[PDB]
Structure 1
Amino acid sequence: MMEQVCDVFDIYAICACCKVESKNEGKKNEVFNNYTFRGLGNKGVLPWKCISLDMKYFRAVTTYVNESKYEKLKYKRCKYLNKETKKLQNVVVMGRTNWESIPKKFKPLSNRINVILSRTLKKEDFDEDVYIINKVEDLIVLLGKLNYYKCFILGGSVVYQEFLEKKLIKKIYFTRINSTYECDVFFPEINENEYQIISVSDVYTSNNTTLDFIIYKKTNN
């Protein structure tokens, strides 16, 4: 008998991945699969300049909350922790490298509870209104104390990798950038027997590239 931490605290992951520059047989008779889209970043930043439609999508998902559903969630969480009954916000978690790659003028992410994972840095090293944690456990701890809607793992390859291995992800909002770029960090390979796509959106063009959004859901059996 047991309840899962990912269902209780509604921890999700959101990302955008382009195709990797594998010049060797990068054309011809190359096999394709969902792992074709795995380029996360290049040299501490994004492989692409600006894909506005992905940003608008990223912002809508990470800032949207349904206040008429919170109490349902509150009860659940308080029940799991064995407890009792401003504007509601979502929580966004990011690795330190992910955080520094953000333009000062956009830190911390507006209308969101910013959480940063780091060992080398501590609260005193930040001026912004953000939470600093040094273990994945502290996030769970923090989540049990805060009033929030949903929790999104904004990323960093390292951050993505460790959250998936621990199966702390309920769903993955994956943006597929249909263009190739130079990358040095990649999204972890998703195990098909653990996560399965359940939704695929319309296809769009933005800043000279097509792209779509898909959703992976954690399987049970």
Structure 2
Amino acid sequence: RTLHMNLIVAVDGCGGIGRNGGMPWFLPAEMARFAKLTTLTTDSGKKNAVIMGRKVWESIPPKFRPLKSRFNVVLSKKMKEESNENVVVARSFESAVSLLQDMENIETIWNIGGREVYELGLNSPFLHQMYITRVEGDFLADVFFPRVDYGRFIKSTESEEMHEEKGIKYRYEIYTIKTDK
């Protein structure tokens, strides 16, 4: 085998995710949870995969650019091939998903996004869960999360407190596709 593609995103009050090619906020604790959720595997020795658009890859600091302990797939029609063994450039979403499903040591595909990547994942058969961090307020984003029918999902009822860093408040949400749930 089973292979799950889980989308992971942090949206503001207007569903915005990005502003001026970068993120509208800095939340170290939320980013630490992101790294944990996208890195940990039930079977050690197996790895997780992160599939991202070109602009997300460019928004990752070059010192951390190949996301450690995770196999990196970058969708791009323009970038040259990446010589690194942990990064691979895929020219289409279907080819990227096929390449990931071929690799046996990949446990879970974490769609970390870009709007087009989020939409493609939302239409993928491997779609399992959405891990949505809902941030309060309007950060005047220029790039947004795709429109999505939450009626396709079941919202997990675990107790979710409010979190706050640097006066920025947010809360975690987990949705599971109704086909699986």
Q: 1:142 aligns with which of 95, 99, 105?
A: 99
Quote the residue 2:13 is aligned against. Answer: 19
Taking the aligned partners of 1:110 and 1:43, their CA distance within structure 2 comes to: 26
Q: Return the offset for 1:196.
A: 2.8
Taking the aligned partners of 1:144 and 1:161, their CA distance within structure 2 comes to: 19
Taking the aligned partners of 1:138 and 1:191, their CA distance within structure 2 comes to: 26
Q: Does 1:130 align with 2:107?
A: no
> Against the structure 1 CA distance between its residues 112 and 93, is the aligned structure 2 distance closer, same or farther, given a 3 Å change threshold?
same
* RMSD value, Cα: 1.9
Taking the aligned partners of 2:132 and 2:60, their CA distance within structure 1 comes to: 20
Structure 1 segments of 4 or more deviating over 6 A?
A: none
Structure 2 unaligned regions, length at least 5? none
SS of alignment partner, residue 181 of structure 1: coil
Taking the aligned partners of 2:140 and 2:101, their CA distance within structure 1 comes to: 40
Q: Is the 8 A contact 2:3 2:126 kept in 1?
A: no
What is the TM-score with the length of structure 1 in the denominator?
0.74
Taking the aligned partners of 1:183 and 1:151, their CA distance within structure 2 comes to: 26
> Against the structure 1 CA distance between its residues 133 and 199, is the aligned structure 2 distance closer, same or farther, given a 3 Å change threshold?
farther
Taking the aligned partners of 1:51 and 1:59, their CA distance within structure 2 comes to: 12
Quote the residue 1:51 is aligned against. Answer: 27
Q: Is the 8 A contact 1:90 1:149 kept in 2?
A: yes
Taking the aligned partners of 1:204 and 1:177, their CA distance within structure 2 comes to: 9
Q: Is the 8 A contact 1:199 1:216 kept in 2?
A: no
Q: Relative to total residues, which structure has the larger strand share, 1 or 2?
A: 2
Q: Does 1:111 align with 2:87?
A: no
Q: Does 1:218 align with 2:177?
A: yes
User: Deviation per CA, 1:111-161, whole angstroms, max 9, x where unpaired?
Assistant: 1111111111231xx354301111122123212321122110010011101
Taking the aligned partners of 2:157 and 2:8, their CA distance within structure 1 comes to: 14
> Against the structure 1 CA distance between its residues 64 and 122, is the aligned structure 2 distance closer, same or farther, given a 3 Å change threshold?
same
SS of alignment partner, residue 160 of structure 1: helix
Kindly tell me the number of residue pairs found equivalent between the two proteins: 177
Q: Is the 8 A contact 1:117 1:134 kept in 2?
A: yes
Quote the residue 1:66 is aligned against. Answer: 42
Taking the aligned partners of 2:6 and 2:17, their CA distance within structure 1 comes to: 17
Quote the residue 2:167 is aligned against. Answer: 208
What pairs with 1:46-195 in structure 2 (closer than 5 Å)?
46-48=23-25, 50-67=26-43, 87-123=45-81, 126-128=82-84, 129-146=86-103, 147-195=105-153
User: Deviation per CA, 1:169-188, whole angstroms, max 9, x where unpaired?
Assistant: 21100011123211011001
Q: Is the 8 A contact 1:93 1:152 kept in 2?
A: yes
What is the TM-score with the length of structure 2 in the denominator?
0.89
Taking the aligned partners of 2:154 and 2:125, their CA distance within structure 1 comes to: 13
Structure 1 unaligned regions, length at least 5? 1-6, 21-37, 69-86
Q: Is the 8 A contact 2:75 2:91 kept in 1?
A: yes
Taking the aligned partners of 2:62 and 2:79, their CA distance within structure 1 comes to: 17
Taking the aligned partners of 1:142 and 1:52, their CA distance within structure 2 comes to: 32
